[PDB]
Amino acid sequence: GHMIMANWQSIDELQDIASDLPRFIHALDELSRRLGLNITPLTADHISLRCHQNATAERWRRGFEQCGELLSENMINGRPICLFKLHEPVQVAHWQFSIVELPWPGEKRYPHEGWEHIEIVLPGDPETLNARALALLSDEGLSLPGISVKTSRLPNPTLAVTDGKTTIKFHPWSIEEIVASEQ
């Protein structure tokens, strides 16, 4: 018989983020359009959530443990960040995100509990990651108001472009590769 593997959209504990996805799809589509970023050729790595309540993080953890498996859990700035690999992906446009990042509440307070950013892997030399990512963004986009850009074992330089609430990041490695680098 076909394997019974709960899809993330079927889990009671994840109903809020399932309902929050359409909003995020629009957010990413719009941000990419303003930045003049061509999404089609870019390789998806993982999608990330943000919460401000510990209870919310715990609830989502219980939910992801019903539709995925833990890839890693690391202490980042005094709080845990879990990376889960799901049996079935979170569909975002043409992308199929199999890995979800679940960070506990940290220093910065994000008012919205739900989808917040995605990370793209740009193969090549880590030393030029920032420069290569910046080259993918149009001049008009970078100069647009409200839009900002910032920078952040294996060197994992991460270039992040944002509108204030929705963010797209680029880095040299995939999560599975980072996990492998430390075994």
Structural domains in the chain plus CATH codes: 1-183 (3.10.180.10)
Residue type, 68: G
Calpha distance 37→138 (Å, rounded)? 7
Q: Which residues, at least 6 apart from 3, have a Cβ–Cβ distance to it below 8 Å?
A: none
CA–CA dist 135, 82 (Å, integer) = 31
Say if CB 171 and CB 156 are below 8 A apart.
yes
Determination method here? Answer: X-ray
Compute the distance between CA of residue 114 and CA of residue 93 in angstroms, rounded to an integer. Answer: 18
Which amino acid appears at position 17 of this protein? I
Distance, CA of 92 to CA of 1 (rounded, Å): 29
User: What sign does the dihedral 111-62-17-73 (CA atoms) show?
Assistant: positive
Q: How far is CA 136 from CA 22, 28, 58, 156, in A?
A: 25, 15, 37, 19
- Residues contacting 54, CB < 8 A, separation 6+: 104, 105
* CA–CA separation, 41 and 123 (whole Å): 12
Q: How far apart are CA 180 and CA 24, in angstroms?
A: 30
Cα 42 from Cα 86, distance rounded (Å) = 21
Give the C-alpha separation, 24 to 100, whole Å. Answer: 14
β-pairing, 68-76 vs 95-103, is unpaired
Q: In terms of DSSP H, where are the helices of the chain?
A: 15-35, 54-64, 129-135, 139-143, 175-181
Strand partners, 72: 83
Give start and end residues of each alpha helix (H) in 36-124: 54-64
User: Contact, 139 vs 122, CB < 8 A?
Assistant: no
3-state DSSP assignment of residue 30 = helix
Q: Classify 60 as helix, strand or coil.
A: helix
| CA–CA distance, 18 with 86 (Å, rounded to integer) | 14
Q: How many CB atoms lie within 10 A of CB 38?
A: 10
Q: Quick one: DSSP state of residue 42?
A: P
Q: How far apart are CA 7 and CA 26, in angstroms?
A: 22
* Burial of 109 per CB tally in 10 Å (0-12, 13-18, 19+): exposed
